[PDB]
């Protein structure tokens, strides 16, 4: 359009380009769109492309000051959803120029943050986003990633073991350090603050950091293995966040954690850059299937959020538990794991992957398993997550009848028995009970752990 | 190779991959290689791929700690040179992982900086380098670029006019400012320090900056047009460079210059980032056809250096004069201009372009013409460089018989007469004399300028 004509217009003629082949540099998005009744699919897809890019609810004269054809998002393909009929899949391409370099949420909130519909869409859901390699290279990514983290902690050949201190709230700093010390000396690689342990009246953050670090050094000397505790630096302001991270580094803490939900993207991205500058490992917690990622027809799918968290940066990523999930979503669990750790993820509709995602050299992220898991879950966990994972047993360790050290040892024995059995070629999920029962013959701690919780 | 065997080996079996299709992310290089007598072309091309990447003159056991197949540079095609027979063209692909992000010379010195031959090559010359868009996005590029620079200076519809103050050395600060004031009030958009005016005993830099800035403000008030003077911040140390740039910003100087040859890549890249952070325009001088880029069979071609300077960052780029060059290299002049200003440069062997170069959204750079040019050159200059250029007339302005102001006016009249004639559809190069002669009827300054130097 070369001439200005005020007034509301349809979006199909500008924002629906069925003959458009996406450039390699394009940000691609797959939306599950349920259009308003009567509205054609091509128009509704065009409406989402307009509102998430250069479109306005009415024609503006300022469009003619730039070239819309270059800058606009444009829907280029529509596909039926297998199962539903109301919804359809819109594939929309966004020129890479639309986004701030190294600011992956600026992609995200442009796409769905403030995209209400332009009166043509009654339901939107962002399924997948292809971040082109050109854009990936501008993001910080994980400050260290799997391979460097293993080198720094000198840990090889098995999943790492962690544990959140319980109760979630209420412990004094010294009692917190006692719990940490007992877990670490018993065989856990890591302990961690609970996500909502920041700096409360019952335990100020600086006191916690000091006692925890003393606990970490003591257990490391008494086991001869490197130990860590994710010190939670999540804070109300960035200054406070950086101050706590600086104190963690000052006292020699190898690893910190950040609640991405509490803190937000800006804080997390800054923290991840800080962590790479200061050689501190960064554990990220972002609950999924909670508010944002649980509704199957309304919201942002967790694999998009997973991609964002990897670009924003984190050496570990945790959402929810995987074993309690059904065998059906286990295929989605395996696809989730691959987005975190692999360099190139090919398209696979069965797993929910609509685009090839190329990470290039961006480091992978440790996948974290938590939840109400105990020793009996260990075979499934080892089989599903493999070696490049952290298995966190909070209640499973502090809930052992003989205390933290024994609980840590039980989990450590169970983990190593499963890893050894896997390396011997045994099907550890099918033979799980027998593997644990045999290892329990030499580990009284494991024996009573298996009696404490049910197979 | 899976097993370690010490000893010197040929490179053909690892570093010559004729079936390799370059990835879009690969750094591509075109070398003109003259091999040692007896050595096969495929071996010599393999030797250059090895030495510029993961190769060693003898087999090392540490190769087996990594995957060479992923990381190695590999020659993938060989072509004859049209004209020579001793030389040939080697096309070598480098995985993007080999290079530090945003450090384009790390690409350059890896390629040719320290690549002697591995005893298989007696002559090397880097002709072109394909920087993939993924790598381009990691570089700072020009701090502002053509369009933003025109917006900041409020200059539209013509080439900009500049002038180096002469004599190159010897003027006091106050006399320097006098020369600047007279040029600027006469109609030049810019004046500039000579490249080797830094901080000499006859003129300390701080005194120069102050008097020049006073000259710039005065002439701007007396002409009603925005004025600038490229203050040379080239300095022995980075601290000193930044200090001078900071003083330029503090006194309101809109533009600074940096001698890339004197200063070097690291200083220039840091300065360009500083300029974007502080809204200061950056003029870059890098002499070509001087030491590095003049020898046609030995050295780095100026178009590779041009690409580096655009990625490193500069709002203007100057090397040497274009009009005195022959009509043959005018096609190479036009190709040089396009690498500076355009977004996508297609491959064109006739101009020396062996790869499509995609800049994406990286801003273009003003091309600068200098040398012993005067009014008679103006038609050719306007025709060759077009509007997005700076035409610098040092001697052509200060060598006017009536002084700087008259000289500036003569050049300003000549430039505007050529631009107006071009906009009227006239062939200004063929009609150059008539265009200038007609404009000279109304401009006595131009009239005697045309009598001062020969058509």
């Amino acid at each position: 359009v070369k001439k200005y004509s005020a007034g509301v217009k349809e979006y199909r003629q500008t924002y629906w380009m069925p003959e458009y082949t996406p450039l390699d540099s394009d940000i691609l998005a797959c939306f599950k769109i349920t259009p308003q009744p009567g509205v054609d699919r091509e128009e509704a897809a065009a409406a989402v492309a307009a509102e998430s890019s250069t479109g306005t609810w009415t024609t503006v004269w300022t469009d003619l000051l730039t070239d819309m054809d270059y800058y606009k998002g444009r829907a280029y393909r529509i596909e039926d959803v297998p199962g539903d009929d109301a919804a359809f899949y819109a594939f929309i391409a966004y020129p890479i120029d639309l986004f701030e370099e190294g600011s992956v949420v600026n992609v995200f909130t442009s796409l769905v943050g403030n995209v209400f519909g332009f009166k043509a869409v009654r339901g939107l859901r962002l399924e997948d986003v292809r971040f082109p390699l050109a854009y990936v290279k501008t993001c910080g990514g994980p400050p260290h990633g799997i391979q460097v983290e293993r080198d720094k902690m000198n840990k090889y050949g098995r999943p790492l073991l962690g544990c959140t201190i319980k109760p979630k709230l209420g412990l004094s700093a010294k009692n917190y350090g006692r719990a940490v010390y007992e877990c670490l000396r018993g065989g856990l690689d890591f302990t961690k603050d609970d996500e909502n342990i920041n700096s409360q009246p019952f335990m100020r953050w600086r006191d916690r950091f000091l006692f925890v670090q003393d606990a970490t050094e003591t257990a490391e000397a008494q086991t001869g293995e490197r130990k860590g505790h994710y010190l939670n630096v999540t804070a109300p302001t960035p200054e406070e966040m950086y101050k706590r991270a600086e104190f963690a580094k000052e006292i020699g803490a190898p690893i910190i954690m950040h609640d991405y939900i509490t803190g937000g993207f800006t804080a997390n991205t800054g923290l991840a850059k800080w962590c790479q500058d200061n050689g501190v490992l960064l554990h990220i917690h972002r609950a999924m299937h909670a508010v944002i990622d649980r509704n199957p027809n309304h919201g942002i799918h967790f694999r998009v959020l997973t991609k964002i968290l990897r670009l924003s940066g984190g050496d570990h990523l945790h959402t929810g538990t995987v074993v309690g999930k059904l065998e059906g979503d286990r295929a989605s669990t395996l696809g989730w794991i691959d987005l975190l750790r692999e360099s190139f993820i090919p398209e696979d509709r069965s797993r929910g992957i609509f685009f090839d995602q190329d990470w290039g050299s961006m480091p992978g992220v440790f996948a974290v398993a938590s939840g109400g898991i105990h020793v009996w879950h260990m075979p499934a966990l080892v089989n599903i997550f493999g070696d490049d994972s952290v298995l966190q047993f909070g209640g499973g360790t502090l809930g052992h009848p003989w205390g933290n050290a024994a609980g840590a040892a039980a989990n450590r024995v169970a983990l190593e028995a499963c890893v050894e059995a896997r390396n011997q070629g045994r099907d550890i999920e099918k033979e799980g009970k027998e593997i644990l029962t045999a290892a329990a013959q030499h580990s009284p701690e494991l024996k009573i752990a298996m009696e404490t919780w049910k197979e | 190779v899976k097993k370690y065997s010490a000893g010197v080996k040929e490179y053909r079996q690892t570093y010559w991959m004729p079936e390799y299709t370059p990835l879009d992310s690969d750094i591509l290089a075109c070398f003109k290689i003259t091999p040692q007598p007896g050595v096969d072309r495929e071996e010599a091309a393999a030797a250059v791929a090895a030495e510029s990447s993961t190769g060693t003159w003898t087999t090392v056991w540490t190769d087996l700690l990594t995957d060479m197949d992923y990381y190695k540079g590999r020659a993938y095609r060989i072509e004859d040179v049209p004209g020579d027979d001793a030389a040939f063209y080697a096309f070598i692909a480098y995985p993007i992982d080999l290079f530090e992000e945003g450090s384009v010379v790390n690409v350059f010195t890896s390629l040719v900086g320290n690549v002697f031959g591995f005893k298989a090559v007696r002559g090397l010359r880097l002709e072109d380098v394909r920087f993939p868009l993924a790598y381009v996005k990691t570089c700072g590029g020009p701090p502002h670029g053509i369009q933003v620079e025109r917006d900041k200076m409020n200059k539209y519809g013509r080439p900009l006019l500049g002038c180096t103050i002469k004599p190159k050395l010897g003027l006091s600060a106050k006399n320097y400012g006098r020369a600047v004031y007279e040029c600027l009030r006469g109609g030049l958009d810019f004046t500039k320090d000579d490249e080797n005016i830094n901080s000499q005993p006859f003129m300390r830099w701080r005194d120069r900056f102050l008097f020049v800035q006073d000259a710039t403000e005065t002439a701007e008030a007396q002409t009603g047009e925005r004025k600038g003077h490229y203050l040379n911040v080239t300095a022995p140390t980075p601290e000193e460079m930044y200090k001078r740039a900071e003083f330029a910003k503090e006194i309101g100087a809109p533009i600074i210059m940096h001698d890339y040859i004197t200063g070097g890549f690291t200083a220039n890249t840091g300065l360009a980032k500083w300029c974007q952070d502080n809204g200061v325009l950056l003029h870059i001088h890098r002499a070509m056809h001087a030491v590095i880029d003049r020898n046609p069979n030995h050295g780095i071609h100026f178009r590779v250096l041009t690409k580096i300077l655009r990625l490193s960052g500069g709002d203007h780029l100057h090397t040497g004069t274009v009009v005195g060059k022959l009509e043959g290299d005018r096609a190479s002049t036009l190709g040089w201009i396009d690498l500076l200003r355009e977004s996508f440069i297609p491959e064109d062997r006739s101009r020396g372009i062996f790869f499509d170069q995609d800049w994406g959204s990286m801003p273009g750079v003003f091309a600068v013409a200098s040398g012993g040019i005067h009014v008679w050159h103006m038609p050719a200059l306007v025709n060759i460089f077009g509007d997005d250029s700076v035409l610098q007339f040092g001697g052509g302005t200060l060598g006017h018989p009536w002084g700087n102001a008259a000289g500036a006016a003569a050049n300003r009249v000549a430039l505007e007469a050529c631009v107006e004639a071009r906009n009227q559809g006239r062939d200004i190069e063929k009609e150059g004399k008539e265009i200038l002669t007609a404009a000279a009827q109304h401009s006595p300054e131009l009239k005697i300028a045309m009598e001062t130097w020969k058509e």
Binding site: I146, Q147, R341, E342, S343, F344, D356, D358, G360, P363, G364, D388 | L23, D67, Y70, P95
Partner: peptide
């Protein structure tokens, strides 16, 4: 891991 499953492979 890391370079086993590249787009290059």
């Amino acid at each position: 891991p890391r370079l086993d499953l590249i787009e290059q492979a």
